[PDB]
Every structure is written in structure tokens, then in C-alpha cells.
UniProtKB/Swiss-Prot annotation:
The chain holds residues 465 to 813 of 933 of the full protein. Disulfide bonds join C187-C241. May form heteromers. Glycine binds at D79, V80, A81, R86, F131, E175, R176, P177, Y178. The lineage of its organism: Eukaryota, Viridiplantae, Streptophyta, Embryophyta, Tracheophyta. L-cysteine binds at D79, V80, A81, R86, F131, E175, R176, P177, Y178. L-methionine binds at D79, V80, A81, R86, F131, E175, R176, P177, Y178. Belongs to the glutamate-gated ion channel (TC 1.A.10.1) family. It is found in: Cell membrane. Glutamate-gated receptor that probably acts as a non-selective cation channel, at least in roots and hypocotyls. Can be triggered by Ala, Asn, Cys, Glu, Gly, Ser and glutathione (a tripeptide consisting of Glu-Gly-Cys). Mediates leaf-to-leaf wound signaling. May be involved in light-signal transduction and calcium homeostasis via the regulation of calcium influx into cells. Contributes to pathogen-associated molecular patterns (PAMP) elicitor-mediated resistance. Disruption phenotype: Impaired glutamate-triggered (and Ala, Asn, Cys, Gly, Ser and glutathione-triggered) membrane depolarization and calcium rise. Reduced wound-activated surface potential changes (WASP) duration in the wounded leaf, resulting in a decreased induction of the regulators of jasmonate-signaling in the systemic leaves. Glr3.3 and glr3.6 double mutant has no detectable changes in surface potential in systemic leaves and the induction of the regulators of jasmonate-signaling is more strongly decreased. This is Glutamate receptor 3.3.
Length: 242
């Protein structure tokens, strides 16, 4: 039986959430894709889902996958971005979902995209627990003093509404899937500029794990048979603002 870590999310639970009143039962987009993929393997993969997080805020996704390296988890199933400090310690599947960072802002301010954000010195929101914090600090050399962690779409909206002068932010940098859910309930805001990274989401296993290989073939079959799109439509259909 594999001990599979699953992020205990407090927000954007469409992706993955613990079933209320349970410790080990989960649902969501990421769970349905993992189940559908495992069901295409020619061998059984018995799993027990183990929540990772304190239940009060979204967990550190990098710390979650580090639990594979110490042997606490046999793998991690969730909305986990396939980024370099993680691929060097664990093996991911190929992406089952596309992702990448975008800039969210009000229209009609100096923030037109990531370059105008880096040229300026305004506070920038990011999602609690996300790789985006390290990406902004290390890849783009944004001062840690500008970076404001936000835990929920209500927190995103309050920070954007308040803006830099009232303890909020000029813009939020986060992965497109979260941002599309956010904007569908918060149309006063928009993506400005282009998606400027492109790491997808994968399932994570120990280095050299054949599961990371075999499940990428299963992903091909879900993509071809229309099940990846059907599971997307089940959980993530949203009301466009435009
Ligand atoms: Na990959």
C-alpha cells in the first residue's frame, strides 16, 4: 500500500480537497485524474492518501514533495508544479495539466505584465505555499520585502481592492489555473500581459520510480480518449468575465 501525500488545501478546493469529516478521503480534479490514470495500469497500485498541511493555510508544496526524499511518503498527488528545485529530488510524471505564471491586476494601472512589475517597487501578492515566492525572489530578483502571501480568493480580492497604500498589492503573481477560478468570481481584475512560465502539474514519486514513467503513458491515453478534458469540465468550468 503506497502512502501518498495529498495537499490539505483551504482554498481552490476544485483541484483537491479532503472530504469533510474524513482524514484520508479526497476529491477534486487532481484526484479524478490520478484515479483515472492508475485505473489504466496493468497492475494494482493500492494507495492510502495522507493529508499534508496544518489545516489552517495551504501547505508548502516544496516541503510536501521533500517528504518523498525522507521516506515519509511513497509519492505525492496534487496540483504540484514541475519546477527545477523539485525535479532534482523526486521524479514527476509528465504534466497532466498545463500551468504557468500570470500577472493579475486591476486594468488601467502601470502594471501591464511581468516586465513593468519588475521595473517598479510595488507590493506583489503570491499564493501561500507556492513555488512562485522563490521564483519571484530568485529568478526575477524581486525584493522579499515586496512579496505578500495570500491564502484565498477573498484575500486576493481584498489585497487588490486595498492596493499598495492600504496594506494590499499592485498585482498578484500566481499560476493560471488558480487565477482563472479567482477571476470567474472577481471580474474587477484581469490577467495583464502574457503567461511567462509554463511548468505543468505532475504526480511525484521517488527518483527512478517506474510509476513516474508508466503514469505518463496513462496520461497520453486520458488525453487521447477525451477523459482529461471531461475531468477538467467536471471540476473547472467557470463563468468567463468577457
Ligand atoms: Na515532467
Amino acid at each position: 500500500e503506497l502512502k501518498i501525500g495529498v495537499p490539505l488545501r483551504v482554498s481552490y478546493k476544485e483541484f483537491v480537497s479532503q472530504i469533510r469529516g474524513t482524514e484520508n478521503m479526497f476529491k477534486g480534479f487532481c484526484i479524478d485524474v490520478f484515479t483515472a490514470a492508475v485505473n489504466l495500469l496493468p497492475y494494482a497500485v493500492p494507495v492510502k492518501f495522507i493529508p499534508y498541511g496544518n489545516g489552517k493555510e495551504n501547505p508548502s508544496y516544496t516541503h510536501m514533495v521533500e517528504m518523498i526524499t525522507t521516506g515519509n511518503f511513497d509519492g505525492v498527488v496534487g496540483d504540484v508544479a514541475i519546477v527545477t528545485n523539485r525535479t532534482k529530488i523526486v521524479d514527476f510524471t509528465q504534466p497532466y495539466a498545463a500551468s504557468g505564471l500570470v500577472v493579475v491586476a486591476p486594468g488601467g494601472t502601470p502594471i501591464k505584465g511581468i516586465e513593468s512589475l519588475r521595473e517598479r517597487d510595488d507590493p506583489i501578492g503570491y499564493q501561500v505555499g507556492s513555488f512562485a515566492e522563490s521564483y519571484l525572489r530568485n529568478e526575477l530578483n524581486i525584493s522579499e520585502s515586496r512579496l505578500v502571501p495570500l491564502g484565498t480568493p477573498e484575500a486576493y480580492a481584498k489585497a487588490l481592492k486595498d492596493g499598495p497604500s492600504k496594506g494590499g498589492v499592485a498585482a498578484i503573481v500566481d499560476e493560471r489555473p488558480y487565477v482563472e477560478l479567482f477571476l470567474s468570481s472577481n471580474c474587477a481584475y484581469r490577467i495583464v500581459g502574457q503567461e511567462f512560465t509554463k511548468s505543468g502539474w505532475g504526480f511525484a514519486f521517488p527518483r527512478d520510480s517506474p510509476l513516474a514513467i508508466d503514469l505518463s503513458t496513462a496520461i497520453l491515453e486520458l488525453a487521447e480518449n477525451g477523459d482529461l478534458q471531461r475531468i477538467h469540465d467536471k471540476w473547472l468550468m467557470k463563468n468567463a468575465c468577457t
